[model samples]
Target chain A: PQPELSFDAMTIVGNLNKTNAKKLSDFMSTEPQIRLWDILQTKFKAKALQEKVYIEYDKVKADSWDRRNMRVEFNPNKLTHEEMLWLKQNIIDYMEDDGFTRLDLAFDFEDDLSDYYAMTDKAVKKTIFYGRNGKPETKYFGVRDSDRFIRIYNKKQERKDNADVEVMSEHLWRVEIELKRDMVDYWNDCFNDLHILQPDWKTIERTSDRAMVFMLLNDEEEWGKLERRTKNKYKKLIKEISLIDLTDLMKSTLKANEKQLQKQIDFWQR
Target chain B: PQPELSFDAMTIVGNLNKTNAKKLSDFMSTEPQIRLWDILQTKFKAKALQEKVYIEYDKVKADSWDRRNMRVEFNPNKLTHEEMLWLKQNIIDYMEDDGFTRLDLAFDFEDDLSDYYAMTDKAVKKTIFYGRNGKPETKYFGVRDSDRFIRIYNKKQERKDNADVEVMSEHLWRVEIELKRDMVDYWNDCFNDLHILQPDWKTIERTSDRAMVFMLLNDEEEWGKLERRTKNKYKKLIKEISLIDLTDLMKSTLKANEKQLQKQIDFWQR
Candidate 1:
């Protein structure tokens, strides 16, 4: 409510077969059925709808030795807070034991990230632009093919072009981390307890802030070469948002989740 | 360790599309890929594996208004306690908000259900036989098409011929309630908070015993219509396990999920 932080995207890949079908089969009705779909990416698939929320699944061969027989995806925004809460609680089981393959952790702020991005550009080496005009409405740090990537963008302006009918904030923005491959492995290894990231929004909020610090280089030598005034300002931003230790980095990210929003504006040089 | 209670079979029909694929995609590797499987029921199906665990999914069309575009299924026994713990924790998210379409809640015990079935035969009206021997090894109550069904069988004998490699459980037996259709909905409505049955094993242990009472009919009048001696014994049985309140019934089921195994043998009067 104050500032939202969460898993913007997550993917669950497992063979939900005869062994565990009952966990989900009990909630379905006549809204949709299982059958062959020429149009679907797969020949056989099932689509289900519950209340106003919906989900898609692709089922494949039942191999006794493989867990990759199915894939399930859903969006948190499509669900209400209670709904999203319900969802996060469920997959977290898998998160604790088996672990998720990808995690798109994001933190949304009421203020624009534009100013933050200006200083941030020099901090990170890789960059990608999304907006066409005056300045990029969205900025990307890191390669998509790599294990990790960072994205900071306008949530409101991004929503303006989202669909035909949608409202947006005056200066809404987000800081997100897209972790995959080895990066995800590293994350789950460090944070398998799941509860460590409990109150997930806090994790996103703090991590994103520290994430910016890491991306931008909080080191004095990097920022010290610029100017003392700018250096001091970056320190405020560091205090303003993130962590650097891999542990401290996450602890920093985890640390940032707490109450950075209110402190953010106060520390900003303006 | 005491006795086990859990969801045996579940089918998660969902649309695991672009919106939330990241949750799962992060854990994938060279094991599988998304494209086309001519043999699979779906054209776009992904089979994934993590360690020894595997999963299958079918993906389909993405009409913004619909959620049933995918399906996922898994088995609990195939996973270790820690693994299953991780999984149950994950899906509990969906359980709290969206919920599943079916629930095969089961209680596993070391005692034979055959003896319980002798007295229980009179309590339940419908029955289906599984074995073609001196006595049916597997017994079924209620029609599969309806909202509820019950299955009781010998776990050890059943496993003797399983895949030519599985072990025997001696006198292992399982009391399982296959709740589907409206039954699942009712169960979740009554226990949606999830934590109400937190130490899951306790819930199954207590509820299974209570389930037997409901299935067997604990009413003294019904028993009085029979015999005082048998009624007295049944009373010991009721005291042995379960509750009757719908709240008690679930409390009974939930009530039954606790420590009934130790009591079941003591109350057997054998």
Candidate 2:
């Protein structure tokens, strides 16, 4: 079916108008500054098309003991210490690529309806994890759209409010770029260029701490200062939070979904 | 009594070690690139000695009808049509200064203590407003802080929980800067420079929409792009949400306080 887990990614989110999106695609095809290759379009769903673009950049990976783990331990559902150690030791062994898989979608909507879909949504999603019992767990999540698709009322979904808040009535498009963890600096440079070019279209999820740090600094060198200063404190946090006894990072994806769902619930109820 | 509303400000929040704070003060005293004047220590409260600074930059105010109203009209509690007109027509006539009154503070706290106080709190505090009834209505509002003095827990006037979560045991410091609304660009530049100089001390109220925007964009030019791109749409929202009523706007400030209070209640209860 699908290829093996060769790489993981850090993503930045933003939007574009049709004219500018087309112009960017044309420019990208010409290898302006950062070259993007393997461009194609695919039917994402019944009424949506998504653009897929790939970028392959070289990153020198020197061997060291600095393979830090994701902060999933912050989630209430977390892995056992043994599994956390296992993943830290072996996670990089599975990485197959060193660049990005960029996906874009340009949706066609009415002029009056722009406000319904004109903001940013951010979250963290984890798909696979190692368990203390030596088994793999797979979880599925959704691309959350903030404009609509929130349940206003529920007593087991009796429809106290209108159920159909879905804003996607016409052809919709979106672009998602997935960058390998190693090439995050390259990702920062790409956004720096875009911020200089068309700033109006530039957006990032407010919840992404890492993305916010990069966005504020404007370059990798500046971001490096932050990492260098906090290296010890972060290492301490990693050691302190690492779990020792667990069957799984106990169904953390579900808990993460519920936490985010609560935020939407509060917003809608308010 | 404070001087009659001579100026207002957009403030940037930061922390400082005594050494770094002294160095910054020396640099400012020499009237570096951006000229700031009158650096002194004022007792903000009994224990807190805040650094009070003043900026007197000349901004060429050309006469025009381009004095747009602040966008607080969208916050449910809004001025009446007549009062809105009065403000739009005569608010500039009340101005007594053309520059900023800047203040700074140095807080003494352990590095681990920051997360406890990081958040957004917004409120409306009324001084004077043009009313339909021809007198001040004494409207209440948000943007209040409950830091040094918070009433903890009690049961029938008997202590149930420890009343003291006194995080501030010693004298703390803060800097406040008052800027003419027109000179917001210069304010943004000062932060851009500070972010480059000492990236570690940078902090912003996570909940404030206004501060979040200024922190994200490197300068006012980029911030203008956001405004221009969303101009018409935001204008439409402004017009649609603006109310002709008065009592409701007063109620909104209380409701805003309640919403924030709920968060603190959750924290205390937890």
For residues A1-270, could you state the per-residue lDDT of candidate 1 as single tens digits?
244656666555554544344344433332254222333322234443253333333444435444454544555456666755554454223322233456576767676556443322223233433232324456555456666766667777777768635645667877677777556545323232111010111233332233234423411112322344544554555444433112223335544563552332122111
Q: Estimate the lDDT of model 1.
A: 0.44
Kindly give the stretch of ten consecutive residues in candidate 2 chain B with the minimal lDDT sum. B42-51
Candidate 2 — which residues are off by over 4 angstroms?
A: A1-30, A33-270, B1-270
True-vs-predicted CA distance for residue B256, candidate 2, Å: 34
The C-alpha TM-scores of every prediction are 0.31, 0.18
Candidate 2 deviates by what RMSD?
27.5
Give candidate 1 misplaced runs (Cα > 4 Å).
A1-3, A18-43, A50-67, A81-98, A118-127, A130-132, A164-169, A185-253, A256-270, B1-270
Q: Highest lDDT, which number?
A: 1
lDDT of 2 by residue, B1-270 (tens): 111111122222222334433454454455434344433431011100022222121112121323221111111012344543443233212233222112111112222221111111322121112122212212112122411111111111111123634443232211122233334333222231111011221232232222234333444344354456554543443343321222232233334454453442232122
